[PDB]
């Protein structure tokens, strides 16, 4: 039976208004040594909301069901009379985030890696009824060999929140599909919306509906006037218009064959779907 003592914190690698996350490696037993990240949840901080407690059993639900190489594989998972505990893998290769802002602006070829990695952890969703509406650069991890993890399942990591009744809209809102701020009903649509803003803060160095502050953001996301910039490739200029459409139906990825139809995009044309999934592909960068 595995419970806190079983294994020793190294270091606190995060902090919120729920909890913590700590470095761990186990004490004893099978995986000696083994390094993991440690989620420790205060009962008493969410049992009191109805909203919270129900976001954190879809949280342990969504990540007990997944099974995937480019979403956070969660190893264990127990309670104590006041905390709730999750084992998850150790990410290593850092936030995507540190990447965008250490490089500015991708080459295609790098971009093209990620965003299809991407693709197939939200295909892998999609199919189960999950929707991840959070993709952004943050969200987006790398393993020690720098391939793709989508994490943040849960509640909210912020230190800073907007409103006093959701945290829907705590993060940034750059990379959030105009239907959710319009709240106007949605569906898996917003995640390849999601995609596409992420795409074009790799290839342009900023998210495609940025201004002076979170209101002149907000009014450009609704307003929906995508400016394509010249030095973009085809393909590339091609998938952002298919992605960024205010229309979520029109969207490519809206349709019937989901991530199927992003994947066979001439984007992503040198892709080889099989080596990627089994992880055979090198990451143009690797954390070592
Ligand atoms: N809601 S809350 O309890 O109050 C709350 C929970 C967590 C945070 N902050 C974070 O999770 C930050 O990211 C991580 O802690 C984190 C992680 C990992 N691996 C990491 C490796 C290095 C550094 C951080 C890592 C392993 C992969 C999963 C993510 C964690 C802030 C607030
Ligand atoms: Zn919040």
Not at 113 to 123: D, Q, T, V
Request: aromatic content about 10%.
């Amino acid at each position: 039976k595995i419970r806190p003592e079983c294994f020793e914190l190294l270091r606190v690698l995060g902090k919120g208004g729920y909890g913590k996350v700590f470095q761990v490696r186990k004490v004893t037993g099978a995986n000696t040594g083994k390094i993991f990240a440690m989620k420790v949840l205060k009962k008493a901080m969410i049992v009191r909301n109805a909203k919270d407690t129900a976001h954190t059993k879809a949280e342990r639900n969504i990540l007990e069901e997944v099974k995937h190489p480019f979403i956070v594989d969660l190893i264990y998972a127990f309670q104590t009379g006041g905390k709730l505990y999750l084992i998850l893998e150790y990410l290593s290769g850092g936030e995507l985030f540190m990447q965008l802002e250490r490089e500015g602006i991708f080459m295609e070829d790098t971009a093209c890696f990620y965003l299809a990695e991407i693709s197939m952890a939200l295909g892998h969703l999609h199919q189960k009824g999950i929707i991840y509406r959070d993709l952004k650069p943050e969200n987006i991890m790398l393993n020690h060999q720098g391939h793709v993890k989508l994490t943040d399942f849960g509640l909210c990591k912020e230190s800073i929140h907007d409103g006093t009744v959701t945290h829907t809209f705590c993060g940034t809102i750059e990379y959030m599909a105009p239907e959710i701020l319009m709240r106007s009903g949605h569906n898996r649509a917003v995640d390849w919306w999601s995609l596409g803003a992420l795409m074009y803060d790799m290839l342009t160095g900023a998210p495609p509906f940025t201004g002076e502050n979170r209101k002149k953001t907000i009014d450009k996301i609704l307003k929906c006037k995508l400016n394509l910039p010249p030095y973009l490739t085809q393909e590339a200029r091609d998938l952002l218009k298919k992605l960024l459409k205010r229309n979520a139906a029109s969207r490519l990825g809206a349709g019937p064959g989901d991530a199927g139809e992003v994947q066979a995009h001439p984007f992503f044309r040198h892709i080889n779907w099989e080596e990627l999934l089994a992880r055979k592909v090198e990451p143009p960068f690797k954390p070592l």
